[PDB]
Amino acid sequence: PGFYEIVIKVPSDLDGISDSFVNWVAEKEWELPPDSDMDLNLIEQAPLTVAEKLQRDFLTEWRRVSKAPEALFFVQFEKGESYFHMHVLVETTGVKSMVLGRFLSQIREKLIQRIYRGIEPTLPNWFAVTKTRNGAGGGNKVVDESYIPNFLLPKTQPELQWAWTNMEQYLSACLNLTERKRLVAQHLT
Amino acid sequence: PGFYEIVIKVPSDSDSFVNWVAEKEWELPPDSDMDLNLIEQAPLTVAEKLQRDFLTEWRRVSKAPEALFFVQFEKGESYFHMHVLVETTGVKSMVLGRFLSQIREKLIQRIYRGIEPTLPNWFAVTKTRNGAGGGNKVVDESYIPNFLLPKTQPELQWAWTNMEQYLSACLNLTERKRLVAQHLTHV
Amino acid sequence: PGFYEIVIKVPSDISDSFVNWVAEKEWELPPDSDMDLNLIEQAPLTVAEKLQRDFLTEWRRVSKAPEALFFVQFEKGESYFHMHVLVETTGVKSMVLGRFLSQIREKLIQRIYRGIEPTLPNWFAVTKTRNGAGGGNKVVDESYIPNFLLPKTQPELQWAWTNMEQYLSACLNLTERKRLVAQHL
DNA sequence: GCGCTCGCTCGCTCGCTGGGC
DNA sequence: CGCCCAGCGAGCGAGCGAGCG
Ligand SMILES: [Mn+2]
Ligand SMILES: [Mn+2]
């Protein structure tokens, strides 16, 4: 049961959108669910609002092309350094590596149309599948589930902004630092 | 007119029933002076298929039917192995690997019933280095007299060619001995 | 901020090498130069100028660093005319310099030499950390310029080019060269 | 030093794949 | 049903350079 990784960068500005009027980005207030132990004040809501649409729309489209509704996914939204970015992990089922690119460009175009009103973002490499090499000419990387505990779960605030999954073992972990800490230590095994 | 070299290992391998490997009896053609008793027939039977299927496929990918080749099957200390020499025409070095895998796969399907052989490095193109990162080697015709023709029994098992100058030499020790000595006469 | 060094040799034979365009450019020292125009050989300089201009055009393409720092000095050596090209390492990892420099080398041959490789032994050579085989591509820092390039005087010094602010004046000025050498020491 | 070794790098090649039209 | 062509990615091999003796 392997995963492809797509990294999607998210800015702080957007089209259309402006603070002087009502828009879909600014109108959304976010709340942590009861079972979260995170600090809402370190979570930047406008970028999170955009991220949520992007991953929701990504997975809707993904399910169309893969013909696998119920495909397993783990999505984590992060604040770098330079850019906000989302790691999207999506199960390979229904999408042979040979054919991922032609499908991801359909999804990429759809996201531009719907979220960005037809205007491609100017962020440098804003929609990028993870390859087996740093340079040109590698294969689309397939990572197994252990990527999540090894690389995603350890992230803490404010780098960690939000996460989403339909994987049972990680539902609790998405927004719980203590549960993240537990699965990380339980994975060293 | 240069050659690529592919070395294909063949194993020493059911006896309770009829199969294509065991059913074949081999005989030396009349013009051969070799000793049939030093030739191991089950491995030779497999080798013949491998080289026949190799060259059928090679012709497809090269678009050169009538491509020149020399194939020699040998018994080493460890493994039986065949040296396949095939003319470079139609197959740039950049592109040899992608084509040889297609051939390798076809051999596994047809001869090995889809089960890859467990022999260590059983299908190996000759490179310009012993390690990784060299080029595909191109040898000219003189490789045959220098390195292939001198082999004698039981190291020499069999050979095949469509090169007019070496037809006689395949299975004739005296003719091998002659072309070897005639090749030094040229140096 | 380090530099790779490429040494490019340039041949002596206006004529009759049959490449007559080296004769057709007249050179002038800019006003601020104190050099003697009569000790500057213009046909070889004419070629050298094209070589370094084209080298740096190509260097920018492969490095993806327009505005890369460089210092180029053209010399009349004991054996050949040659230019020392110093170019900033940015954008070009040492592992990959060779594959890029051959592209540049081939470009120069096509464009300056009309496809005919020069017969000068070793005419396009990166500086290594050893005299023999098996060393690394050398990285020198800026101080190479004052220590080894700036002291050269006429007629060994023929010409220089740079986009480094501190050395603009020094390219064609012996007094300014003399000053930066003493200020460095 | 100095000639050589050999595991490794990565920009680039180009026949193949298979949705879209 | 047959082309188109963006995506594919193993294979390529000159170049690399610490290490060896
Ligand atoms: Mn042998
Ligand atoms: Mn010098």
PDB file of all heavy atoms in Angstrom, chain B residues 172-184:
ATOM      1  N   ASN B 172      35.562 -26.549 -35.868  1.00  0.00           N
ATOM      2  CA  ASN B 172      36.796 -27.148 -36.342  1.00  0.00           C
ATOM      3  C   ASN B 172      38.062 -26.575 -35.670  1.00  0.00           C
ATOM      4  O   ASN B 172      38.453 -25.440 -35.924  1.00  0.00           O
ATOM      5  CB  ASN B 172      36.878 -27.018 -37.853  1.00  0.00           C
ATOM      6  CG  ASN B 172      37.885 -27.965 -38.437  1.00  0.00           C
ATOM      7  OD1 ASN B 172      39.083 -27.699 -38.403  1.00  0.00           O
ATOM      8  ND2 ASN B 172      37.420 -29.108 -38.886  1.00  0.00           N
ATOM      9  N   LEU B 173      38.678 -27.401 -34.821  1.00  0.00           N
ATOM     10  CA  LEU B 173      39.880 -27.051 -34.047  1.00  0.00           C
ATOM     11  C   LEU B 173      41.063 -26.723 -34.937  1.00  0.00           C
ATOM     12  O   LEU B 173      41.763 -25.734 -34.661  1.00  0.00           O
ATOM     13  CB  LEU B 173      40.266 -28.190 -33.091  1.00  0.00           C
ATOM     14  CG  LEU B 173      39.228 -28.473 -31.990  1.00  0.00           C
ATOM     15  CD1 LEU B 173      39.521 -29.777 -31.250  1.00  0.00           C
ATOM     16  CD2 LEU B 173      39.114 -27.296 -31.017  1.00  0.00           C
ATOM     17  N   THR B 174      41.274 -27.532 -35.989  1.00  0.00           N
ATOM     18  CA  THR B 174      42.328 -27.282 -36.996  1.00  0.00           C
ATOM     19  C   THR B 174      42.144 -25.962 -37.735  1.00  0.00           C
ATOM     20  O   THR B 174      43.096 -25.248 -37.955  1.00  0.00           O
ATOM     21  CB  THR B 174      42.386 -28.386 -38.068  1.00  0.00           C
ATOM     22  OG1 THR B 174      42.392 -29.683 -37.439  1.00  0.00           O
ATOM     23  CG2 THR B 174      43.607 -28.223 -38.971  1.00  0.00           C
ATOM     24  N   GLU B 175      40.914 -25.657 -38.126  1.00  0.00           N
ATOM     25  CA  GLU B 175      40.603 -24.387 -38.788  1.00  0.00           C
ATOM     26  C   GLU B 175      40.725 -23.212 -37.807  1.00  0.00           C
ATOM     27  O   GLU B 175      41.150 -22.121 -38.201  1.00  0.00           O
ATOM     28  CB  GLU B 175      39.201 -24.449 -39.426  1.00  0.00           C
ATOM     29  CG  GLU B 175      38.769 -23.247 -40.265  1.00  0.00           C
ATOM     30  CD  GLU B 175      39.561 -23.041 -41.550  1.00  0.00           C
ATOM     31  OE1 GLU B 175      40.242 -23.990 -42.055  1.00  0.00           O
ATOM     32  OE2 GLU B 175      39.518 -21.883 -42.051  1.00  0.00           O
ATOM     33  N   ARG B 176      40.366 -23.429 -36.544  1.00  0.00           N
ATOM     34  CA  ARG B 176      40.610 -22.426 -35.500  1.00  0.00           C
ATOM     35  C   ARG B 176      42.095 -22.143 -35.376  1.00  0.00           C
ATOM     36  O   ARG B 176      42.533 -21.009 -35.526  1.00  0.00           O
ATOM     37  CB  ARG B 176      40.055 -22.888 -34.154  1.00  0.00           C
ATOM     38  CG  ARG B 176      38.572 -22.689 -34.052  1.00  0.00           C
ATOM     39  CD  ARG B 176      37.935 -23.429 -32.887  1.00  0.00           C
ATOM     40  NE  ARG B 176      36.525 -23.035 -32.793  1.00  0.00           N
ATOM     41  CZ  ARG B 176      36.010 -22.169 -31.925  1.00  0.00           C
ATOM     42  NH1 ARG B 176      36.737 -21.599 -30.973  1.00  0.00           N
ATOM     43  NH2 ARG B 176      34.719 -21.904 -31.978  1.00  0.00           N
ATOM     44  N   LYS B 177      42.855 -23.202 -35.122  1.00  0.00           N
ATOM     45  CA  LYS B 177      44.330 -23.141 -35.079  1.00  0.00           C
ATOM     46  C   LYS B 177      44.948 -22.390 -36.291  1.00  0.00           C
ATOM     47  O   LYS B 177      45.913 -21.633 -36.114  1.00  0.00           O
ATOM     48  CB  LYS B 177      44.911 -24.561 -34.977  1.00  0.00           C
ATOM     49  CG  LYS B 177      46.372 -24.643 -34.595  1.00  0.00           C
ATOM     50  CD  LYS B 177      46.817 -26.105 -34.482  1.00  0.00           C
ATOM     51  CE  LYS B 177      48.267 -26.387 -34.175  1.00  0.00           C
ATOM     52  NZ  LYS B 177      48.859 -25.387 -33.254  1.00  0.00           N
ATOM     53  N   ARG B 178      44.368 -22.572 -37.485  1.00  0.00           N
ATOM     54  CA  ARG B 178      44.859 -21.931 -38.708  1.00  0.00           C
ATOM     55  C   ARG B 178      44.606 -20.441 -38.723  1.00  0.00           C
ATOM     56  O   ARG B 178      45.512 -19.675 -38.943  1.00  0.00           O
ATOM     57  CB  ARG B 178      44.250 -22.566 -39.954  1.00  0.00           C
ATOM     58  CG  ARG B 178      45.046 -22.313 -41.228  1.00  0.00           C
ATOM     59  CD  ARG B 178      44.347 -22.869 -42.466  1.00  0.00           C
ATOM     60  NE  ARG B 178      43.018 -22.272 -42.676  1.00  0.00           N
ATOM     61  CZ  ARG B 178      42.790 -21.028 -43.117  1.00  0.00           C
ATOM     62  NH1 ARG B 178      43.799 -20.200 -43.423  1.00  0.00           N
ATOM     63  NH2 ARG B 178      41.536 -20.589 -43.253  1.00  0.00           N
ATOM     64  N   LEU B 179      43.373 -20.023 -38.468  1.00  0.00           N
ATOM     65  CA  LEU B 179      43.028 -18.588 -38.438  1.00  0.00           C
ATOM     66  C   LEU B 179      43.723 -17.815 -37.321  1.00  0.00           C
ATOM     67  O   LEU B 179      43.994 -16.621 -37.465  1.00  0.00           O
ATOM     68  CB  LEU B 179      41.512 -18.407 -38.327  1.00  0.00           C
ATOM     69  CG  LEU B 179      40.711 -18.828 -39.556  1.00  0.00           C
ATOM     70  CD1 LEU B 179      39.245 -19.037 -39.198  1.00  0.00           C
ATOM     71  CD2 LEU B 179      40.861 -17.808 -40.680  1.00  0.00           C
ATOM     72  N   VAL B 180      43.997 -18.491 -36.203  1.00  0.00           N
ATOM     73  CA  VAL B 180      44.762 -17.886 -35.099  1.00  0.00           C
ATOM     74  C   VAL B 180      46.180 -17.572 -35.567  1.00  0.00           C
ATOM     75  O   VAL B 180      46.643 -16.454 -35.399  1.00  0.00           O
ATOM     76  CB  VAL B 180      44.756 -18.785 -33.822  1.00  0.00           C
ATOM     77  CG1 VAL B 180      45.754 -18.308 -32.766  1.00  0.00           C
ATOM     78  CG2 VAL B 180      43.365 -18.786 -33.211  1.00  0.00           C
ATOM     79  N   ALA B 181      46.849 -18.568 -36.146  1.00  0.00           N
ATOM     80  CA  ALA B 181      48.208 -18.408 -36.653  1.00  0.00           C
ATOM     81  C   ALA B 181      48.276 -17.422 -37.835  1.00  0.00           C
ATOM     82  O   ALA B 181      49.230 -16.642 -37.936  1.00  0.00           O
ATOM     83  CB  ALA B 181      48.790 -19.759 -37.049  1.00  0.00           C
ATOM     84  N   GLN B 182      47.277 -17.468 -38.721  1.00  0.00           N
ATOM     85  CA  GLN B 182      47.152 -16.524 -39.846  1.00  0.00           C
ATOM     86  C   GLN B 182      46.902 -15.088 -39.365  1.00  0.00           C
ATOM     87  O   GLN B 182      47.313 -14.143 -40.037  1.00  0.00           O
ATOM     88  CB  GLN B 182      46.041 -16.976 -40.827  1.00  0.00           C
ATOM     89  CG  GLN B 182      45.480 -15.921 -41.798  1.00  0.00           C
ATOM     90  CD  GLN B 182      44.465 -16.503 -42.773  1.00  0.00           C
ATOM     91  OE1 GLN B 182      44.751 -17.442 -43.493  1.00  0.00           O
ATOM     92  NE2 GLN B 182      43.274 -15.957 -42.778  1.00  0.00           N
ATOM     93  N   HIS B 183      46.219 -14.924 -38.234  1.00  0.00           N
ATOM     94  CA  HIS B 183      46.028 -13.602 -37.644  1.00  0.00           C
ATOM     95  C   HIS B 183      47.334 -13.007 -37.049  1.00  0.00           C
ATOM     96  O   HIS B 183      47.493 -11.784 -37.051  1.00  0.00           O
ATOM     97  CB  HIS B 183      44.880 -13.630 -36.613  1.00  0.00           C
ATOM     98  CG  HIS B 183      44.544 -12.283 -36.046  1.00  0.00           C
ATOM     99  ND1 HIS B 183      43.940 -11.293 -36.796  1.00  0.00           N
ATOM    100  CD2 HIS B 183      44.768 -11.747 -34.823  1.00  0.00           C
ATOM    101  CE1 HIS B 183      43.791 -10.210 -36.052  1.00  0.00           C
ATOM    102  NE2 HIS B 183      44.288 -10.460 -34.853  1.00  0.00           N
ATOM    103  N   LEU B 184      48.284 -13.837 -36.602  1.00  0.00           N
ATOM    104  CA  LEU B 184      49.592 -13.320 -36.099  1.00  0.00           C
ATOM    105  C   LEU B 184      50.466 -12.929 -37.278  1.00  0.00           C
ATOM    106  O   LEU B 184      51.100 -11.883 -37.256  1.00  0.00           O
ATOM    107  CB  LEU B 184      50.327 -14.297 -35.167  1.00  0.00           C
ATOM    108  CG  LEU B 184      49.480 -14.838 -34.000  1.00  0.00           C
ATOM    109  CD1 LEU B 184      50.249 -15.933 -33.268  1.00  0.00           C
ATOM    110  CD2 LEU B 184      49.013 -13.731 -33.052  1.00  0.00           C
TER     111      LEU B 184
END
